[PDB]
Write a protein that binds this ligand. Structure first.
Ligand SMILES: CNC(=O)Cn1cnc2ccccc21
Length: 165
């Protein structure tokens, strides 16, 4: 199972780790992707997860979009986890760099409640432009299922733990 995680609450855990390396080691039932509405996995967590699948995640995602159209900001879809997990829960957090509504972050975290345990990044953090301290607060106040957060950046991980209320 998951190892080396710091317990924040009854159900939220955090570790300074590369989510791709974490997924390969654990092979969780669900890995969460920080997706956009088009499932275009170009950069950040999405680009890294997709590259680990040798682009199989993008091929599957393009077929999903051709059939279903784009996701909503705050929405999600369950696709294959490929070599990383049983499933990948593609969750769209608001991208504040694309002028999207930050109040949608709670809606985005609500998707995690449909899965008993997940390996996840902080939604809307990184290249999505939101404050990761705010994202962690929304996560612990929204997610009731067991979420193992992988924070890539060591300095951000320390800031998150040392400032956690
Ligand atoms: C093998 N893994 C990678 O390519 C590392 N990597 C790149 N962007 C990232 C963003 C978040 C976490 C890990 C990330």
């Amino acid at each position: 199972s998951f190892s080396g995680y710091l317990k924040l609450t009854d159900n939220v855990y955090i570790k300074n780790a590369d989510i791709v390396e974490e997924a390969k080691k654990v092979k969780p039932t669900v890995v969460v992707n920080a997706a956009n509405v088009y499932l275009k996995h170009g950069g950040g967590v999405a680009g890294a997860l997709n590259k680990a699948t040798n682009n199989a995640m993008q091929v599957e995602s393009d077929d999903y979009i051709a059939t279903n159209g784009p996701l909503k900001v705050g929405g999600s879809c369950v696709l294959s986890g490929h070599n990383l997990a049983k499933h990948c829960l593609h969750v769209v957090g608001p991208n504040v760099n694309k002028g999207e509504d930050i109040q949608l972050l709670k809606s985005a975290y609500e998707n995690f409640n449909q899965h008993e345990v997940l390996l996840a990044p902080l939604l809307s953090a990184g290249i999505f432009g939101a404050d990761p301290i705010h994202s962690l607060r929304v996560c612990v106040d929204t997610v009731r299922t067991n979420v193992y957060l992988a924070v890539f950046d060591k300095n951000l991980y320390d800031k998150l733990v040392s400032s956690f209320l």
